[PDB]
Amino acid sequence: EMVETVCGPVPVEQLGKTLIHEHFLFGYPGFQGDVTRGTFREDESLRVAVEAAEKMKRHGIQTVVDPTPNDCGRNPAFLRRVAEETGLNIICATGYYYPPYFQFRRLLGTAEDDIYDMFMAELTEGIADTGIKAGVIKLASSKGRITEYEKMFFRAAARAQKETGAVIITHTQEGTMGPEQAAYLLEHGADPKKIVIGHMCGNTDPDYHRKTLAYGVYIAFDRFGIQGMVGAPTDEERVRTLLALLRDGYEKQIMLSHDTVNVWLGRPFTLPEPFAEMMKNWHVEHLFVNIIPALKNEGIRDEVLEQMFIGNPAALFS
């Protein structure tokens, strides 16, 4: 009935139009060490975050899942500022991006238990002293592999999901390990109706998707607008793939997002001009002003789109 947001418990029936995967802040692990040239501008960042939020609100978005990992600059108090300003629901995550802190604890023998303990504290007690609980557990695997280290988190996550009924959301690397992630989680008693396999758009083969869908998990095409980088496919290939699945009747299992980074942590940078032009549509409005349109031209009805944007998040969190 309720999900934890950065503003406390919210009835699931009120989440409405939802983006399943967007980052207000994000930094790659290691950004912390580059503090001197990469200082966090809090009032400017807040401004950008608020803008991004209003943009979503313009297209009816009432709720956003921000799955920024604990080691990637997750900042629940800052996200609470955004929500307090805009009235946007924001659900944050507990999890790590895809050693040696946990490598050390593996030596101690307590690593998997420590991770489970972290997930439980952050799901049921609160993150640091923010009084904010995460609503999702965030997981990530490597290219072509779910490593022993990663499986620790997958096992801790499954155990925490049993206890809390929390949602698991995952990162797949370069369109691999979708079926493996779903199978491994189910092995350990996770509930498929509470799992989103992420970055599934990274793979263009519909068989791979169906293989994953057969587990009864949600899949996310959540990188709309990312092109020419991280071995990613084109938006055209995304739509093609998404079209095969929808025509095949899979709409109760699919959600869409952009995986935007609205504020980058660490040292500012500028993408080179080959990369730069390709990434031009990577922003929180893209789904609504480009993708959803082309989908309609391909005959996707509104009941379906609503299933993805409203029905599916509502099923997922309830």
Indicate the annotated binding residues. Answer: 21, 23, 138, 171, 199, 259
Residue stretches of the annotated binding site for Zn(2+): 21, 23, 138, 171, 199, 259
Half-sphere exposure at residue 264, Cβ-oriented, CA atoms within 13 angstroms: 11
Give the distance, in angstroms, between the CA of residue 221 and the centroid of all CA atoms in the same chain: 10
268 binds, among a copy of itself, ligand [O-], Fe ion, none (CB under 5 to 8 A by kind): none
Beta strands in the chain, from DSSP E residues, in sequence order: 2-5, 8-11, 18-19, 23-26, 63-66, 89-95, 136-140, 167-171, 195-197, 218-221, 254-256, 261-264
What is the number of other CB atoms lying within 10 angstroms of the CB of residue 35?
Answer: 12
The contact pattern for Fe ion, residues 249-288, with x = CB under 5 A and - = no contact, is ----------x-----------------------------
Q: Based on CB atoms, which residue is closest to ligand [O-], 222 or 251? A: 222
66 near Fe ion (CB under 5 A): no
Distance CA 11, CA 144 (A): 38
Q: Based on CB atoms, which residue is closest to Fe ion, 152 or 226? A: 226
99 binds, among Fe ion, Zn ion, a copy of itself, none (CB under 5 to 8 A by kind): a copy of itself
Distance CA 77, CA 3 (A): 17
Q: Based on CB atoms, which residue is closest to a copy of itself, 140 or 239? A: 140
8-state DSSP, 166: P
22 near Fe ion (CB under 5 A): no
Q: Based on CB atoms, which residue is closest to ligand [O-], 93 or 305? A: 93
150 near Fe ion (CB under 5 A): no
Cis, bond preceding 274 (omega within 30 deg of 0): no
Which range touches a copy of itself (CB under 8 A), out of 183-191, 217-225, 263-271, 279-287? 263-271
Total number of residues that touch ligand [O-] (CB under 6 A) = 2
Instruction: Find the shortest distance in angstroms from Cβ 68 to a copy of itself.
Output: 11
Q: Based on CB atoms, which residue is closest to Zn ion, 81 or 199? A: 199
Q: Based on CB atoms, which residue is closest to Fe ion, 112 or 259? A: 259
202 near a copy of itself (CB under 8 A): no
User: Is residue 200 within 8 Å of 209, Cβ to Cβ?
Assistant: yes
171 near Zn ion (CB under 5 A): yes
Inter-CA distances, 160 with 110, 155, 192, Å: 16, 9, 14
Residue (of 150, 161, 211) closest to 191 by Cα position = 161
Binding site for ligand [O-] (CB under 6 A): 171, 259
